[PDB]
């Protein structure tokens, strides 16, 4: 095999097609059906394609291999190996030049726009209804004029000469040959130099680029029309003989036969000089046949013989799932593989798996033969086979010996994440079922209810090393998604341990003193002491407190027997305290965590195995069961229910009299029923929880019960409080189809019996649930496929880019408290710059250091609040990332290794968990100082810190300078405490009207009406003395027809008349009353500062929408630059807002629809990208205005909200990598080296600017603008075209790459997979690096 | 069900699909992605060519395994050549370059 | 059986060229050009190469020195 690269694609010239072909196929016949020898001139022909049987001619004159180039005189077939019949192509000489459907019907019709003729006309031409005048010489008719029948008639009669018109693909080919590429190209450049308008300039630039591509690539356009047509080798379009004298053939054979028929009939008709109409009909018919051959389905859909289904054409074979790339080039079918049902097998070690004898023998057959021949037990391979078929003891001994260290791969059908394939050492067992280690089931999401698994065998030495090193179970204990352990004990183990550790007030052997665990076990196994009984024991724990030395501390602790028995296994390093407690699910998980962090891997593995074994054993000894009497119906249920029924009856009767609406009664009933449910639940938990009143020596006592169902609840083994309720209480409220909640609940439980109605309702519930899970799984699968697709090519290429940039990460304190602390958020990230203690010049962390647990604890000891850390998005490396910018986090602990494909791991980690997807006063929870951020207040006369800013926040500083609680305080909210004041727990710090945003006046004086005329634009509807009114200052849209341009206003003047000016500014306060300006305080009351002017009253789809960046149909509006905004030309149909910069130029106008309400006033201080209208913001604006770190923080937080709502932890780095892959593209705004408008990746722009500015000449000095593109288009715009063709529209990408003459250096992973060479990732990176040195070297 | 080696398919020289005839398991794209998450390049390579698609490769590997040596010679998958032939059957010239 | 490779990855932290050096060693061992430097306990050559790596006797540079010594030896 040669070492090659660069697969090149281009238009095939007709002479090259003639070059490939070995012969003409003249007749459509294949074989004589009598003698099965092939036809002399047929789709299957020996003289063209090859000999049927190896090295023997058709007529049978020459059959020996001695002859290798001779061509039999009788049958013109050369004698060679039949394999060649797999590669020889044929050809058909078409009489009429025919168009290639792909280059015509593809949505952008490249023949169409290349010829600058719309698609509709070309279609009109292809079906032979009308002519077109192609280069009609010196007449009064243009060059692309379509001509109808009688238009051709009157033209011909009028213009005998100077009239050139023709029809069909031959006319089109004539048009193509005569085109001058460069002259039109230069003309187009001149036109672009003269034209300045967006859309026409874009279509023109695309077209000019197309012309440049043709003149550079060297393809001539006329080649789009076919003259000779190649025919695929026969073995690729087989004619297989079905058992029973019948044959099975692909439909392509039929299509080829039809094509040959139409060609031969057209040839004969031409030789006969038939009238034009008939030859035109024949040419049309040949067109249908050919286009059905190429892509059947873009026409009248020529169906197949007697099947009513459309037959499959070549395009169908390539494109699509069933066809190709997915099925046969990414979805192969390996050898040495098996499948079977999975089973428990508790006795196994964590690193091993039970494998049936017979499958193992079948798989390892060739190894067995090799070893048998090596030992000399068998002379030859057939004797080895016979020895395997007898199955003697020696064979089993050799099989045991060879299997010894050879590892096998286990896979489970939905491989969601990388833990779907793992390696194990097999142990031969009887039976036909595979035995799977229990601890790994959680990783596989495996269940023993008929699930099956596949088993592959790695052959080569490198495969063995890879399986044992990278894939072995013990090397993968941490999930790649988050750092936490994956292998935690599931249900039986935790139940057994829980039973073991819980203590009881009084039992046998209370308070006796034991010298160690060994006699504790002596006592338990002899039945002289209970497994749980409080006792004082002497124990020697070990602690590595010094620099790696273990110090024994030995003292007397008061514990249970069970905890000591468990202590027997526990390795040295762990504190005794760990086991001293109840030891539930959480306790065991954190136990494993500590064991890993202190000792390391190997002790953790052995400790997990020991835990499993002991848990199973003592769970079996416990004998825990579940009887009908074990779940006690609370005695006071019936009273509570009857009371609630009486209450519902009273509220319904008080409804029938008509003092309360139906909805109010509904709400009341639902709330009272909820309260009754909570009451019964609490009563049940009280009854069941602590009921064991067992007696000590004298009086009695009570303790946490040993009720088996209670232990199952409390231990966290199975069930939650909700299910306990569902077993023994009333099973709450239900939802009807539409989501509305039924009024009467289900009062019965499964211990009792339901009746028809309650069952029926719950049936509906369960049905909806199941359907939900089904659709959820389908959508999940699809989403994760897209994710893994887009991010595949990203690889860690460089060790360190060396940038100082990074994102300043803070703990996300959503509202009430700290949903997620800093320490976990920063663990394993390198720092962007040294962080200082709360006192300057006290460096805590040198320049970029990887933040491991020790640094995080050190930060916890201090009070660092926010840390700028290097992020992947800001990484400087070109074409990949550097180790430092990423960080450490992995299934292993150390810094990321160069070469790891983080894209795929990130995509899997994001995808797999995706299968479960009044307000009057603020009340500070903890005693702290109140602090206001982004505000400018003005103390009024009432003694309130009046809020005049719309972006005001009220955070909470604790004793040591940290923001515990954070709230957003709107404009017009009454405040109580200012700055410095310490606030007691749950004290009202703020106040505001729920259904009212007041407008606050800054100065005093009399309210003056200006352009506030009565009757034309306003309607005086005023109330009585107390000074109530409904004066309505309407907006521009709702203003009356006469008062369309007259804008009523309210100027705030003083007692004398002069408009009092805002302090410090000269602006005459002229408040144009906005829409719905309810002027309550009428003319005649000296305005106080603060009078109101106008009262103004998730899951998977959400994730998909965030990741597709869809504008949420009501976007908020932002500010571009800061400075005084102002109004403008009023009521054109969309009200104008002109942002006036205090320094910069004014002319930025933004139209606003009538319905939009604005929250900010004209004379306000906006910041760039500040909110102007309320509502959800579309990510595009935030990215464009605020920049990268803002949009990345927004996306990460928005996704993490959905994910944490379900309680699934994911590390931000994966989302970060995806986001970085999303914004790969930019758009050029200046000039100097690019084409001034081309969408170009940010990578090429950065590298070219680095080059240019490195070069002594300034050159381009180019400035660019970032762009954000959705994952679909971003994947569509990949560099390699094989990646895109692998999954997208095959016709489109194939046509683009064919016309562009593109050259693929493969450079990627998926390309290398397709070509079957080593991927450039991981173990193969070095290989590619070696090849990398071979290029561009000596 | 299990198979070591057996009959291969006619057109694409991959092992038959099914249970009546021995037939191998389908190593799908998701499994490929799983392997890519690890650095497992040689296992995937052999799985892709020597195990299924390379005729000379499969026979050479059978003989080599029998000999008690464990190497490989990946070559180019036949299905890729079929792809080339099918694309060439259209008017598209796609060539494997060399330098 | 080698149930954990933790010491071998702690010897060379890349975790990838570990596989390459172990492959070179196990390839010199399988085709019987060389001999194991550790007393074998009926292990196969993979676990032998890992056992040699974990004891610090073999790495890439030791491979390079032994190969060039063998080259100059057979050159004469
Ligand atoms: Mg199952
Ligand atoms: Zn002959
Ligand atoms: Zn970097």
Tab-separated table of C-alpha atoms and ligand atoms in Angstrom, chain A residues 342 412 445-452, ligand 1:
chain	number	residue	atom	x	y	z
A	342	UNK	CA	-26.492	-9.967	30.638
A	412	UNK	CA	-24.399	-1.986	25.238
A	445	UNK	CA	-27.516	2.270	32.397
A	446	UNK	CA	-27.912	-1.500	32.211
A	447	UNK	CA	-30.885	-3.400	33.608
A	448	UNK	CA	-31.373	-7.161	33.900
A	449	UNK	CA	-34.710	-7.454	32.122
A	450	UNK	CA	-33.671	-8.926	28.794
A	451	UNK	CA	-31.139	-6.284	27.781
A	452	UNK	CA	-28.434	-7.631	25.488
D	1	LIG	MG1	-33.380	-4.246	30.376
